[PDB]
């Protein structure tokens, strides 16, 4: 489970490359699973 | 419609700085991985 950014979500997938995809988390090419994403602005977005 | 073309040649290129810039929203390369780009040498590079 992650805190990743919205524009970033695309990166949690097999082939992609990018900031998170390289340094933070790397899904394998062969990945067998699902990627479930839902923005939780309410839970963690405070003023400031 | 007017698109400008610039000719770049006779030098050495550091593309990694370009890749390692947070500044570009989209950096998609068709044919080169953005990394390992430093390894290539070309006759003429055109920038639009």
Curated annotation (Swiss-Prot), chain B:
Changing residue 18 to I: In strain: Omicron/XBB.1.5, Omicron/EG.5.1. Changing residue 26 to A: In strain: Omicron/BA.2, Omicron/BA.2.12.1, Omicron/BA.4, Omicron/BA.5, Omicron/BQ.1.1, Omicron/XBB.1.5, Omicron/EG.5.1. Changing residue 25 to F: In strain: Omicron/BA.1, Omicron/BA.2, Omicron/BA.2.12.1, Omicron/BA.2.75, Omicron/BA.4, Omicron/BA.5, Omicron/BQ.1.1, Omicron/XBB.1.5, Omicron/EG.5.1. Binds to host ACE2. RBD also interacts with the N-linked glycan on 'Asn-90' of ACE2. Cleavage of S generates a polybasic C-terminal sequence on S1 that binds to host Neuropilin-1 (NRP1) and Neuropilin-2 (NRP2) receptors. Interacts with host integrin alpha-5/beta-1 (ITGA5:ITGB1) and with ACE2 in complex with integrin alpha-5/beta-1 (ITGA5:ITGB1). May interact via cytoplasmic c-terminus with M protein. May interact (via N-terminus) with host bilirubin and biliverdin, thereby preventing antibody binding to the SARS-CoV-2 spike NTD via an allosteric mechanism. Attaches the virion to the cell membrane by interacting with host receptor, initiating the infection. The major receptor is host ACE2. When S2/S2' has been cleaved, binding to the receptor triggers direct fusion at the cell membrane. When S2/S2' has not been cleaved, binding to the receptor results in internalization of the virus by endocytosis using host TFRC and GRM2 and leading to fusion of the virion membrane with the host endosomal membrane. Alternatively, may use NRP1/NRP2 and integrin as entry receptors. This is Spike protein S1. The chain holds residues 351 to 398 of 1273 of the full protein.
């Amino acid at each position: 489970s992650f805190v990743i950014r919205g524009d970033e979500v695309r990166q949690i997938a097999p082939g992609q490359t990018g900031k998170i995809a390289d340094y933070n988390y790397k899904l394998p090419d062969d990945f067998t699973g699902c990627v479930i994403a839902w923005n939780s602005n309410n839970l963690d977005s405070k003023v400031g | 419609y007017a698109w400008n073309r610039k000719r770049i040649s006779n030098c050495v290129a550091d593309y990694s700085v370009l890749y390692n810039s947070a500044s570009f929203s989209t950096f998609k390369c068709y044919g080169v991985s953005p990394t390992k780009l430093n390894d290539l040498c070309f006759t003429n590079v055109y920038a639009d």
